[PDB]
Every structure is written in C-alpha cells, then in structure tokens.
C-alpha cells in the first residue's frame, strides 16, 4: 500500500506522544485511530481538513487526498479479505441524529471509500443510543470491548466509530506445562513474579545496532507477524527514538532462524485513551475548536468534535494473541 509507510510513521508519532506522558503499559491500534480520522476528514474543509491528514503523517503535496482515501479503501478491503487461519475484521459505523440535514456526498464517500455502515439514531433516548453503539462495537470485537460508551450527550448530532478485531494462533505455540512464575524487572531494583511462557526452539531473532535491541519475529498462522524489541541495558529510550518504517521493513525481510531459549510473559492489557490533547500536539486542533469546519457533514449549523476516545485490549498466551481496538469520535 502507498499509505503503509505513513501509517507506520503515525504509529511511531502517536507512540512517542503516549510514552512522553509516568510509565504505564501502552497498547493501541494505529490503524483504528488513523482510519476513523481519515474517514472524518471527508466531511471537513480547509485548515480543519489539512491538519487532520497531516497529523496522520501525510504530506498532501506528495500524496493527493484522493490517493490517501483510495489507500484506506484498499487497506480496509485487504484486512477484511477471506482467511481461514487468522481472524481479522475491521469496520466503520456512522451514527446520525434523526433529522440531521446530512450532506449526501459525505454519506456516499464514507460508504464507498471507508466501507462505512450508516445508522439513524435518536440520541435523545440515551440508553437506546448507547446500546446501539455499544452493540456495534461488542459484536465487531467479538465480546472483547463491552460497553465502550458510558455517557452520551442527548444533544449529540453524530458519532463515528471504528473497530478492529484480531485473533491469531502462534505458528509455533508454547506448552502450558512449561509456563512458570519468573521475575520481571519493573526497574533495576524491583521485581514481581509473572507467568513466563518458555520454549527452546528455532526463532527468528536478530541483534540490531541501530536499535541497540534484540529483535524477535513471532509468526502467526496466516498473514500476520508480531515483532518484539528487547532493548539492551539502558537503551529503551534509544530504541523508542530510532524506530522507523524503513528499519521495520528490513527485519521483516530476514527469514533466518537460530536456536534460542525464549522466555515471554503472558499478557493481559487494557487501556482507554483520551487522544484529544496528544493529537493536538501532533497538530490536529481546529477540528476540536469552535472554528472547526465540518461543513461537508452538514451545512445546517456549525459542528465540532468534542471527544476522541480509543480503547484497546490485548491477550497474549501460549496459543497466540487476541486483540481489539475501538475509536469513538463525537
């Protein structure tokens, strides 16, 4: 895809915003966040529009807008394509107030380019409106993200939601009977016991001088791979600073494997992000202001975004990985 390099650089830009905030587990979906905002940009104009796409790491002089949206159209279609060994689904939903005077071109554009579903919602019946949005997300994430929306203004005019769902099996899974409690060094002086999966086997593992890290590629059955970066002592900040899309592509091209004894923890991570302020530091601000130009959505009255909430959940265990994300714009 002509937009995959931009999506990777957006992943790293957003990651670096989140890592600059004390230290916490980070987990998010770059594709979910970017797809929701690119879809929203179809309804925006002028500076409001240019800021969104530039905040997704597109240069509009180098890649015209029509090529950006066709990029997402093909990306989404490919992520959803039939596949027997890997579960992977993604969808967009547009929830519109009854009697919102909708600009038809916006509806036609989001259906064609972002494959969006569209629903008429009475946000005045808040329990039923929340139930529908939460139903869309719960069914999309196969039960992994439940009750995404807890409070929803009864005067809401529209909401835009993206979800993504992933469930893969390891090409070479771990054996549950070999998982044991081992120390995790949360810092140089403190440890906690965690369940550590263990296998002696043939792994795709390399040491990177640019990253000062060991790099492990764990393949899933089907068309996905997880990449793990283990920084050298004192080099976690260096690792975070040096990640680039070109460096990642180089690792994916190496197919070599070597014997190693791998210890990898089971993981269960959940987090909810208010992305308004960090997206602001990536340059996306006018759309959240009273000067927002969303006149491609409706021309009846001025409209702006007030919320940009992302939730993502991750399970890693001996069989594989299950992950889901949702992006909610209102």
């Amino acid at each position: 895809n002509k937009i995959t390099p931009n999506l990777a650089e957006f992943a790293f830009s957003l990651y670096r915003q989140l890592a600059h905030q004390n230290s916490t587990n980070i987990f998010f979906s770059p594709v979910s966040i970017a797809t929701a905002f690119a879809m929203l940009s179809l309804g925006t104009k002028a500076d409001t529009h240019d800021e969104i796409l530039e905040g997704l790491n597109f240069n509009l002089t180098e890649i015209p807008e029509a090529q950006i949206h066709e990029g997402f159209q093909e990306l989404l279609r490919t992520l959803n394509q039939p596949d027997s060994q890997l579960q992977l689904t993604t969808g967009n939903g547009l929830f519109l107030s009854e009697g919102l005077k909708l600009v038809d071109k916006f509806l036609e554009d989001v259906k064609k380019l972002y494959h969006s579903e569209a629903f008429t919602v009475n946000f005045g019946d808040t329990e039923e409106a929340k139930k529908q949005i939460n139903d869309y997300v719960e069914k999309g994430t196969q039960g992994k993200i439940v009750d995404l929306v807890k409070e929803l203004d009864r005067d809401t005019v529209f909401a835009l939601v993206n979800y993504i769902f992933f469930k893969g099996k390891w090409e070479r899974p771990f054996e549950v009977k070999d998982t044991e409690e081992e120390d995790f060094h949360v810092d140089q002086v403190t440890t906690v016991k965690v369940p550590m999966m263990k296998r002696l086997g043939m792994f795709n593992i390399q040491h990177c001088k640019k990253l000062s890290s060991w790099v492990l590629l764990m393949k899933y059955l089907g068309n996905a791979t997880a990449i793990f970066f283990l920084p050298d002592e004192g080099k976690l900040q260096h690792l975070e600073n040096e990640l680039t899309h070109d460096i990642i592509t180089k690792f994916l091209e190496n197919e070599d494997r070597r014997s190693a004894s791998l210890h990898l923890p089971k993981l269960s991570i959940t987090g909810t992000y208010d992305l308004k302020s960090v997206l602001g530091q990536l340059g996306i601000t006018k759309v959240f202001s009273n000067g927002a130009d969303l006149s491609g959505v409706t021309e009846e009255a001025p409209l702006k975004l007030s919320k940009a909430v992302h939730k993502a959940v991750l399970t890693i265990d001996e069989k594989g990985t299950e992950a889901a994300g949702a992006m909610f714009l209102e």
């Epitope: 689904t89 139930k131 529908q132 139903d135 069914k139 999309g140």
Partner: antibody
Amino acid sequence: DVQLKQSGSSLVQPSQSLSVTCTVSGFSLTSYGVHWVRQSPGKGLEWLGVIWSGGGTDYNAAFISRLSITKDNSKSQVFFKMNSLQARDTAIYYCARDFYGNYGRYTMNYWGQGTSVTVSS
Amino acid sequence: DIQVTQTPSSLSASLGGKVTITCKTSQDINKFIAWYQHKPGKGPRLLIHYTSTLQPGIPSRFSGSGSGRDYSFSISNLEPEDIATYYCLQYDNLYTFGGGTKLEIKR
C-alpha cells in the same frame, strides 16, 4: 465491507434437493445471524429461516419438514438446503444479514446477490 | 406464524402525487415493522425500521407511522425513480413480509 456472496444459479430436478452457499466477509458469523428469503415469479418476498450467531435456527412454519440451515464460522460460510423441490419452488433465493432494528430486535439488510433456481426436468 | 395483510396489492399513482400503503398484523408487533423497496435485478433496499425511522440517505418523500396492529407507509411527491414494488416486514416475532404493493404510473 460487509459482503454476502452466493453460489451460482442452479437447475434442480423435481423431487430433488437444492443447496446454496452464502459466503460472508467484513463481520463474523459468531456475531450476526444470516437469513434466507425467496421470491417466486409473480409472488412477493417470503422469509424461509435464519441461523443465529450462536448456531440456533428458526424456520418458516410451512417449511419445517423441508429446510436445513447450517454454517461453518471458521470459513464464514452459511449453507441452505431444501428437499423435495417441485415446480412451484422455482424462485430467486437470497441470503441477508441481521441489521440493528432497536431494543434488541434485528431486521434484514445487506442482501446477497440472489441465486436463481429453476425446478424442471 | 404472525400474519401480515398489506394493501393494496397494486396501485397506479400520478407523478407528484401521494401514495399510502397499509400493513395490518394478526397480533401486536410493538412497532417492529420495516419497509423495503424492491426493483428488478436489485437487492431489496431498507427504507424504514421501527415503524417510522428512515435510513440515512432515504429521501424525505418516504414516511411511516402506526402502532399495535395497524401500520402505514407513504410516498409523497412520487418520482419516476420511486416506481417499484414495496414490502412491509414485521420483525417482532420471527419475520413475515407483507404481500407487496406494485406501484405503477398513472397516465
């Protein structure tokens, strides 16, 4: 990116059985039900049955002894089978998907392209 | 097992006029009725669900009302692109289509 795609149009001999496959993408069959509907020449739409996300089924009462709907979640396929076809079963057969219809009820949307079936020797 | 009586089964309407179709059910369906447009060689197109809720992009020409066992559907300002067959669907207790209304142009 919600899609329902049906197998090709068939010629069925009288008293023999009809099989149609609906292959879906852009959603999981563990999340939504898939319906089957026919339209005979000069007649209206007629609902035939549904296979729910959990695997349970419901059928039009006039067809209970004739119909079977099964599925394979992992292949995203739904399978429609009807036995003992006669001339009056010539029709276009459609699959369609649950669509949020408020308060926990679902109507039909996202129709397959239809499978024309002619019953004739 | 819920029976649905849709009337009339055929209707000649004038361009720019108004048409009204009714659906009566054999028991209370609690406003779970939807309305579809069907043109030859096309999939049925959802116009309205829960009695009166239009889908995004459906023209204001279309409207629905009712409750209990008695529902109605109307097309105002009839246009040539509206010439089609129309169906109600109860979805309160399984699913039952009305018999359809084939709309034709008066001349």
